[PDB]
């Protein structure tokens, strides 16, 4: 067929139940990651394509850049309880991957800080319980699929995409391809 198991996607053994209907996971020590962000807009051109419905989720994972990580994996959660993704994740791609400023706590904070979230907004947050229980999400979903490597998306907690076996010779046309594909299983 056009679409083949093992191709441009693979089968979880083990389906997972009560997934999220697209589920995606990164981390900010990530250098596809970075790409898939900043270069492809993956995420976007995903959305993009998608039926009606169909809502997506995008998680951080612990496994890549130790103690930073975890507080990463946290401040993701403050951002998804504020909803302000979508004005911290570049300063943070960058301040990790780029300028390498980001070296701590701290220097996370001060990506929300010059974002305009208030301090005593941020601190609350990342403090909070319900962002404690955002991070047990995280990693429940994670877990949840064994995830060791990223970036890494799931449709309907039963198909992973294999990007590894898409053509990369034109990045528009793997963008396709990929979002296409997401389509495909989301229909299945």
Same mark, same amino acid.
């Given at each position: 067929?056009?679409?083949?198991?093992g191709?441009?996607?693979? +089968?979880?053994?083990?389906?997972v139940?009560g997934?999220? &209907? $697209?589920?995606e996971?990164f981390? %900010? %020590?990530?250098?596809?990651?970075? &790409?898939?962000?900043?270069?492809?807009h993956?995420?976007?051109?995903?959305?993009?394509? @998608?039926?009606?419905?169909?809502?997506?989720?995008?998680?951080?994972?612990?496994?890549?850049?130790?103690? @930073?990580?975890?507080? @990463? +994996? &946290?401040?993701?959660a403050?951002?998804?309880?504020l909803?302000?993704?979508?004005?911290?994740?570049?300063? @943070?791609?960058?301040?990790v991957?780029?300028?390498?400023t980001?070296?701590?706590?701290?220097d996370?904070?001060?990506v929300?800080?010059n974002?305009?979230?208030?301090?005593?907004?941020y601190?609350?947050?990342?403090?909070?319980?319900?962002?404690?229980?955002?991070?047990?999400?995280?990693?429940?979903?994670?877990?949840? $699929?064994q995830?060791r490597?990223?970036?890494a998306?799931? $449709?309907?907690?039963?198909y992973?995409?294999?990007?590894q076996?898409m053509? +990369?010779?034109?990045?528009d046309?793997?963008?396709?391809?990929?979002?296409?594909t997401?389509?495909?299983?989301?229909?299945?």
């Open positions: 067929a056009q679409y083949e198991d191709k441009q996607y693979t +089968t979880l053994e083990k389906p139940a997934a999220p &209907q $697209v589920l996971f981390s %900010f %020590f990530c250098p596809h990651c970075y &790409q898939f962000e900043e270069v492809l993956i995420s976007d051109n995903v959305k993009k394509k @998608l039926p009606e419905g169909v809502k997506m989720t995008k998680y951080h994972v612990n496994f890549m850049g130790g103690d @930073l990580g975890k507080d @990463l +994996t &946290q401040a993701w403050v951002a998804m309880a909803g302000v993704e979508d004005k911290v994740t570049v300063p @943070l791609f960058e301040g991957q780029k300028t390498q980001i070296r701590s706590a701290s996370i904070r001060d929300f800080i974002a305009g979230i208030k301090g005593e907004e601190d609350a947050a990342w403090n909070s319980f319900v962002v404690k229980s955002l991070v047990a999400q995280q990693e429940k979903a994670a877990a949840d $699929v995830l490597g990223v970036p998306m799931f $449709v309907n907690g039963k992973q995409l294999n990007p076996g053509d +990369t010779s034109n990045m046309v793997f963008v396709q391809q990929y979002a296409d997401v389509k495909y299983l989301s229909e299945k």
